[PDB]
């Protein structure tokens with residue numbers, strides 16, 4: 001974002017109240033990982049070539065929920081609706097992104113700044129913009145770099161989002177958690193990658209590509225050695241991801 | 250407190266990191282109610298008259314943990330110890346109060362301000378200063394007002410802390426949660442009291458005493474009528490409680 005919109009005092013209070021409601025609900029239900037995936041899938045369809053897609057509430061749409069990459073997100077939508085209903089003033093766009101920021105916070109992650117003002121767009125973006133787990137470097141730069149407009153550093157920091165969660169065979173075809181503490185947000189994702197594959201944990205082709213790249217590799221090593229650096233770079237990347245196509249840029 | 254102490258930039262940085270660590274651990278373990286009871290029992294021992302007791306890390310001591318009213322708090326002290334070891338420069342006084350503030354935040358409660366600077370004291374206070382659940386009005390004002398120095402408003406807002414958590418027969422004799430949502434911080438404690446006793450939910454004599462007092466009753470209806478009012482008052486009472494005898498007042 002560059003020039004953030006001025007929201008009404010009631011909209012602002014709505015946001016402050018929804019944040020508190022989301023914290024308790026997400027904490028109690030232990031669904032932080034799925035909610036972060038929802039926020040990421042909502043924001044990651046932004047394509048700078050056409051200036052379409054992005055964090056604009058379209059994911060709740062049937063057309064978009066039908067995308068292969070969105071398998072299982074229907075439960076995230078259904079989960080949050082009860083809370084969303086108490087806030088008709090807030091847009092789905094802002095709401096899902098606020099949930100994502102809360103998901104990181106509740107699990108012990110850095111506090112990502114949030115700015116309201118996103119509007120809900122009527123039509124969902126076409127399928128195929130989100131990353132393929134079976135691909136590598138080339139693909140990652142095309143998706144995050146060419147389409148989204150993010151930096152190489154951002155790619156690595158955001159991949160760290162896998163520090164929480166796990167894959168489910170019926171949703172993506174892969175299975176298992178990336179770390180030993182799938183509900184704690186830390187830099188352990190990078191250490192697992194550096195220590196090679198092991199039975200109980202999951203490592204996707206896309207995660208491994210970070211190990212063989214000349215730019216990615218030294219960042220994976222820094223993050224594994226210093227959590228504070230990982231957190232600051234993650235916050236920076238998540239903030240930009242969430243405002244893709246919003247408030248000027 | 251009125252005049253906050255200057256702490257090093259490293260100390261403040263440690264506090265912020267500790268806050269993030271406490272969030273993830275407390276949410277994952279679902280022990281927020283227990284953590285708040287620990288913080289409250291740590292601060293509620295202050296005697297303004299003698300200027301003894303209060304939030305100064307003494308609850309980790311065996312002699313104080315042996316106080317019958319602190320039954321089960323030994324478990325909370327142990328649960329947090331591994332996190333405390335990651336932050337050796339932070340005092341236990343600050344640590345426990347910070348943990349109490351976090352417990353409120355993750356359950357959906359208001360954001361209570363925190364100011365570091367409490368020093369740990371070698372001598373825990375004498376037994377018997379904490380409120381007795383079998384008594385009423387006179388005793389509550391005797392404890393909160395005379396000893397601690399809090400107002401009648403503070404007494405009712407603070408009792409609202411029962412919105413999360415439950416009694417355990419092997420800790421106090423009583424059993425059951427006060428609300429049908431013990432991990433969600435809201436004003437349900439007050440509405441439960443106003444609507445009488447129900448099967449399953451708990452109401453202590455000290456809780457019921459709020460209904461038969463000229464000053465307490467109106468406050469109960471005030472908070473039962475408006476959650477925003479409750480949140481503002483609680484945050485204020487909690488801030489005062491956590492700083493009893495610290496930074497002057």
Ligand code: HEM
Nearest residue numbers: 033034036037040131132133158161165166167168171172
């Ligand atoms: C870089 C390329 C990425 C690819 C190809 C990828 C791929 C995947 C796959 C295959 C799943 C689905 C697991 C399932 O079957 O449920 C998954 C889960 C997840 N991913 Fe990613 N991911 C990527 C980037 C990210 C980013 C940028 C974030 C956000 C910071 C993120 C956050 C998550 C989370 C939290 C989960 C776990 C969800 C749960 O526990 O249910 N991913 N990812």
Ligand code: HEM
Nearest residue numbers: 282283285286289380381382407410414415416417420421
């Ligand atoms: C007004 C006088 C109060 C009395 C006499 C009282 C009494 C009690 C008793 C007997 C229990 C049951 C303990 C157990 O068996 O686990 C309890 C639990 C609890 N109380 Fe209070 N309470 C009072 C004030 C407060 C205050 C000021 C707070 C905090 C702001 C608070 C927070 C809690 C919490 C969170 C629990 C649940 C503990 C758990 O779930 O493990 N109480 N209280």
Ligand SMILES: [K+]
Nearest residue numbers: 163179181184
């Ligand atoms: K982890």
Ligand SMILES: [K+]
Nearest residue numbers: 412428430433
């Ligand atoms: K409650």
